[PDB]
């Protein structure tokens, strides 16, 4: 008398690279890079929050601050816009 | 280089679809609205038992028993 359906999203995993700068460039802004990648390749926008291993990071942070190169985060799309 | 990995993850739902034959391609219909009521987005989904794809034309019975767990993966948006 019922079925059980999990739908499923897959994951996109996106190898963004890091510029340059004398600037250097926050976690806020790796959100916006890796959502305009998602944009590009699913035609959603959506709204990231970033977590290292679990950890919530700050989106004030410096990316060299709280990531090596080749490291991974999680990104949790909260909404779409 | 200077490269991060970035993994964007989707909450995956779960839902219960009661059965009142009705087709595999039916219950994705189902499942479809019910995802569309919740997000706002309406999928295109290929429903897999324990891995394999059922196919659309199958009728339930023949595929699936009761309470049975199908994962739906979302293909593309309509
Ligand atoms: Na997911």
Redesign the interface.
């Known amino acids: 008398?019922?079925?059980?359906?999990?739908?499923?999203?897959?994951?996109?995993?996106?190898?963004?690279?890091?510029?340059?700068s004398s600037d250097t460039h926050s976690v806020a802004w790796?959100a916006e890079?890796?959502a305009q990648?998602?944009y590009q390749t699913?035609?959603?926008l959506?709204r990231?929050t970033?977590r290292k291993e679990g950890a919530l990071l700050a989106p004030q942070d410096l990316?060299?601050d709280v990531?090596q190169?080749?490291?991974?985060?999680?990104?949790?799309?909260t909404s779409?816009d």
Not at 69 to 77: C, F, I, K, Q, T
């Open positions: 008398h019922h079925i059980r359906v999990r739908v499923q999203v897959q994951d996109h995993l996106f190898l963004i690279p890091v510029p340059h790796l890079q890796a990648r998602y699913c035609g959603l959506p990231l970033l990316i060299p990531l190169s080749n490291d991974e985060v999680l990104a949790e799309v779409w």
